[PDB]
Amino acid sequence: TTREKKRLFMMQRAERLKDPKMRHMG
Amino acid sequence: YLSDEPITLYTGNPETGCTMTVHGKTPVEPVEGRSRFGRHTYFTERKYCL
Amino acid sequence: REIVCVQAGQCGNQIGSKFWEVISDEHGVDPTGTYQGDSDLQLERINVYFDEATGGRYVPRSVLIDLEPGTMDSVRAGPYGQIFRPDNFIFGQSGAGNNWAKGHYTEGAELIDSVLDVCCKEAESCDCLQGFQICHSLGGGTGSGMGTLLISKLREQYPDRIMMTFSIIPSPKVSDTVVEPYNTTLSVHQLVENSDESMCIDNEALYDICFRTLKLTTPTFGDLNHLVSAVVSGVTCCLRFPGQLNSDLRKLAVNLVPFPRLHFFMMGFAPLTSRGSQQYRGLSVPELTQQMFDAKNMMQAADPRHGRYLTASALFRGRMSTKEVDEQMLNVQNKNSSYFIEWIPNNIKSSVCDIPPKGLKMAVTFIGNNTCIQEMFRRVGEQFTLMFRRKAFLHWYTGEGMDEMEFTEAESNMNDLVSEYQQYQDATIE
């Protein structure tokens, strides 16, 4: 389903960008 | 002699535990092999913030 | 009757840290901010220095300002640092460079609006505001420039209140910086116009207090700042505890200042004695009276023996008789008539307060208005004239933008202050 994949991608992106160092230079 | 920390007034006595309280100190990293007098600036400079 | 504190520069922030430690101890406030005291007398005036935050907590009404954040991380890291409100720390990015013009004109004007916003936030919250209290050094860079700038703005906004300053001035003997005379001269020019009452302290006098009276083996700046915090917390004691003869900062100003420019005072605190000696002497009003006038216990390099007292004030803390206070002040006034200005019939005011600092049976703080303070300013002017005649380091200040005429203004104003004190010293009844 498209909605499930979009929600999953957004959740993983939010998990990645939570660390400021990783947002800067990951 | 290349690795031991010199005994100071600001490090206190290691074999008695006494340590004078003075101005100019900052929080200390607990990692092994690091000096305790390294500067700490997280409170006033949140690094990598935007 | 609420006081607002301003802490400026490294010296000011460190003295402030020790002051708030002393005040938190006297009112039984835990370093987490929780009240843990053991008498209602402690709680009933807590509002004077602390505001109440939600669920038990108390926060201290103080503003911290500095041009480099190195000190601010140190005070936040200190044992009581957590009590301070995070929004109350104001800091820049580049240092004062030990330059008065840089601290006053370039980074001063950049930060001054945010400090005035915080000071207004603190002042407008009080139901009735008493004077401000400021601690700073005159020899530094951000302390001198931004302290005098902020004093000028607060004096514009609250001209009917009291303006009080505690100020450190460079020793003629142990300087840490070469350009001290310029910063000191410009700052005293600002203070003599702006202030209502100013206390001056020499680091040399605190070292002599520690070594001769306390016999400390290894004194540190923490001890000097502890002595200063002790007197600062002592002057306000009658504002916040009951007593047989109440007193107030405005009452001190009215009794101490004969004319508006003569507002520079000497400081002392009496019960100081080494741990070896403590077993040999009990506290009593004669002992406090003898120590309070002993020049060994005075916090300035000028000595009373070269001048005359216009006025003096003594505030006593503790359970004691009023007869002994009155008779001691009468005996000293009658026996020592040569050290008192003769066209004033009685120079000493006394005050008595019931609540001593915890763990001491009695204490007294002494404030003195003596013409010998003119000797310090003349000495600073000598070092300035030696440096100024040769334009020794002037290009830094001129590069910031000052006209040389400002230096001549500061010299003329200091010379007029010395002349006015000298003329009142040699006045006569005729």
Place this chain on the structure above:
Amino acid sequence: REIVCVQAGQCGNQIGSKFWEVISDEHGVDPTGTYQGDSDLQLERINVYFDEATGGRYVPRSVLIDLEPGTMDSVRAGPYGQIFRPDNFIFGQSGAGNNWAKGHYTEGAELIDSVLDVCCKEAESCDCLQGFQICHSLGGGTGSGMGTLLISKLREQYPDRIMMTFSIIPSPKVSDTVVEPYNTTLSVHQLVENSDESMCIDNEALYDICFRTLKLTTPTFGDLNHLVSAVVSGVTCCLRFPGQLNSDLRKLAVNLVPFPRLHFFMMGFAPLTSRGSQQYRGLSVPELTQQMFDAKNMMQAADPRHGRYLTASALFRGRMSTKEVDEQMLNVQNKNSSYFIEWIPNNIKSSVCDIPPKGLKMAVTFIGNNTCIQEMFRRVGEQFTLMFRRKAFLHWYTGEGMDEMEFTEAESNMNDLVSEYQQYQDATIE
């Protein structure tokens, strides 16, 4: 008393999504549409924002419009997207291209009839209709063109209701598009004739709110849209809950607008504080009022200190005494008297509502009519004059069909609006 909301373009659709999340939370509506609340006070005014469909569920009276379906697929994918009625989403097949003329004349007229049909179907279903509420950006393409087209058609069809708009306008410092001045000028020309009351927001002001006040480490557009959703949901609180002194959108308009062209207002919401700082300061009516007038808490780049307040309104939510509200608003009027227009004896209206926003015991929203809004329009007109004198990009608009005379009319109308604000901003001693 029912409100109909219209959300246009990507910014409008995103703010609408956050608004409907906040409103669904306050009335306890599950994302399936089922009522799961815990007090009858929630049900008695649910009609104001929701219509009831059979078997319990509620659906929100909102129309979704955009020229490219990307946002609609995003809102359908959102956490509350399912609640929306499928027939209420209207979309085309090609974008606005950031061009006002494209959004207004060619693709606008093709869809506008279907939007008017849906809006009329929604309006005629209400038992009593209150004003419309519209969210859109003025710098975009479909937001500006179709929003102003729809505003004109609804004002023709419902001239006796209220027309209220919340609008975001491009920063001169943080812009995403080069042709922003043309779209902004034409949109302001349409709004000053068509609107009854217009609120303006700068993304720069919301970023300064987040960074200085909230100390957010990594802010996102969702936070910006929450601040906007908070003020919009706060203005209507007195319409839908009991209180000691009820208020209404029409009552706000009658007290705020002295003359029909002066209907542009500033907004603020007071209880904003970072999670670390909140333990150090309790909320109280003096604190909310002081933050409420603090320009740091105002959502536009223009500063009130460069103008004067003609009128202001404060809506309080929570259980509180009327004496503190009245005396605080009197104290603020007396203390800042130079910033209030002198030919109106009292400029502030107050209102009190019993039910606060979720998670806060009390809150206040502020609406202000201040002449400093002229600085924003002057800045946009300056950038327009730089671009228009050189015919910088006009061929796009002329190829769509616009007469240059439209540009000269819009410029003249905005210049007259700036002049009217400028005469009242400055004092006249004579």
Place this chain on the structure above:
Amino acid sequence: REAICIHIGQAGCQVGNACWELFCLEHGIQPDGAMPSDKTIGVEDDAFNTFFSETGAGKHVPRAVFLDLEPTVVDEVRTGTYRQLFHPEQLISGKEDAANNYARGHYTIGKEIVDLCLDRIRKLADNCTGLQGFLVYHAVGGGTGSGLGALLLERLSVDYGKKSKLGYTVYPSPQVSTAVVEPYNSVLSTHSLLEHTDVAAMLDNEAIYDLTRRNLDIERPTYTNLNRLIGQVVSSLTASLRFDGALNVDLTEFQTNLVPYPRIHFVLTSYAPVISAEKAYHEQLSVSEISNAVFEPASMMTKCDPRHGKYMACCLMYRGDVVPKDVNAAVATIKTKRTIQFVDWSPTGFKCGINYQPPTVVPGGDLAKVQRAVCMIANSTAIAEVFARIDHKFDLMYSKRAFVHWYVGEGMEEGEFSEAREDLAALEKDYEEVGAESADMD
């Protein structure tokens, strides 16, 4: 909160190897650029930030460029032990040397290489948020160091403007010499150093050889010893930015306290506990004794005697176990001495600094390990005597135009010799005039 180092030519790159070896070992960065840290956000330091930046893979890289016209020394850095520490773009090398000609470096060859250096420095300055100066290492005796150092300082002074440039310079020794044409290059170099530097520290190899023979017990010293001493001095001056202390000193405080007039910016440097291990057993090392040591002319790293001039300002940096009261007692005792003289217009002659981090020990080093040290930089009129010995050698060679045809053929007008010689004469007269006691009404 950061400083960028620019290394030019052979002496500057070799001194750079010792400096970066010390800064790595003091902070703890491994030779491949790795350093373990704490896994929880907020419990971490920043002292490395002055000299290193970390990559997203966790490698550390230093804020330095290495500039040379011959490949050999940079290829030696590329193939040595620190191969993985430096970014390869930072190590810039040309094809052929400036052949001891200032003219060849300035006009013909440095003109080709200078734009790559400026592009690298720009890329470094863009990755900063509180840059507070440039540190430059070069020798004025050689062709590329003099010519390209001058050209690069001129370009930096136009592009960056107010930013400070502090130079550590190896000047030609008064009787030890390595090349015949040293006077011409040093004279032409000093004009550029005069216009484009805020503080200039002068070094002579003959003084550091004397210091290593007298204080240390080394019979056959080599350049690595001198470079390790220079690295210790630079580490002492920059420690005030990197570690906790009682009295910090920002680089602008040095310029404010040490420079009285904008041209009077040439300073002498000395370091106190230079002592061998055997001596440590029999010597106390109190604050007053090392303070007395810093004033002995046997401690200086430049061959000049300060008793032939007057001091204008002194800056004393103490690191280690020192208490301010002991510093005050020491400075008052120094002030009492009659062999130490200050100009009468400078009554408050001293600046003090106190830092808690004691000096680091390097595995192959020759200094003993000590709990405290003091370092001094001071401005004195005696330096005017140092320029006179180079100018005499210039006059001796120029009286017969001994080698001028190389400079004129490689692109330089003969007039530049006379202009530079007159500029050094005026600088000598400025140091004579500023140091004259008092004045008179007529």
Place this chain on the structure above:
Amino acid sequence: STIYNAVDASTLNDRCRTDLLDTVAQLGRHCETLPKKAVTTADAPLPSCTFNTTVSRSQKEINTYFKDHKPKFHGALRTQDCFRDTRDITQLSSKEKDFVHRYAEAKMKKSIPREESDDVAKKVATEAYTEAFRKFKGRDPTEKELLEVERLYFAYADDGAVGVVQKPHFHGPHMHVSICNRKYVTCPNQVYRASLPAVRNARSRFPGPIPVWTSTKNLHAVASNDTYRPGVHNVSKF
């Protein structure tokens, strides 16, 4: 829809319609009277390639009212002074002029006579000062002692006496604190005319740690700390 159509289609009576339309017309006229900014016009010498086109682009194209009421109250307090009116704030004060004269005398190493002015305020102040000096001491003041007139600020009392303001107040708004707190825009202790000081814009800097400010030349350009400080020169009255 225009206002005329709405008025003509409304349910109001004729008189209210006429009143509303007249109000709108008067507002329009008063708006026309106001100072304004001139509408922009395209330049004349504009180059080519602005009127030209391209084949693909050509294929794409489709082708009085506000009366003044100033009520006066009997026995209202005096809020003006002659001495206050004479002085101005942009020029040098009298004490500054005195210092300039003393500086010139010290530089030239000789006494310089002062200029004589025919201002009536100076004469009134000198007469009052001479009377006070004669009351305090039997002598008349000398020329040297009459220089004190320049260093002081003078004002009239309510009954017409001449006095000296010991402690002047700020010419902007300030606080007088009593049993209640109050703001006074004007107070008798003020020396200069009352004015509202200019303030710096709160949103001048970028929303972030980067050093970007707004330019001093226009409202949209940006600037940084390169060779000048843009944060100190953003003060403006409006």
Place this chain on the structure above:
Amino acid sequence: KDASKRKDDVPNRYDKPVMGVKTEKNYVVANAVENVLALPTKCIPTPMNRAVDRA
């Protein structure tokens, strides 16, 4: 060729600024005369005018 001039020349040892400026006055008499001429002031609110006294 670079011909820029960044640093100003050092001053002569005889070049001195104007300094040592002193004003001459008798502070006792001046202070007494200023105190005699001083105007009284009050920090209490000014008496408010009644609504009937309008013209």
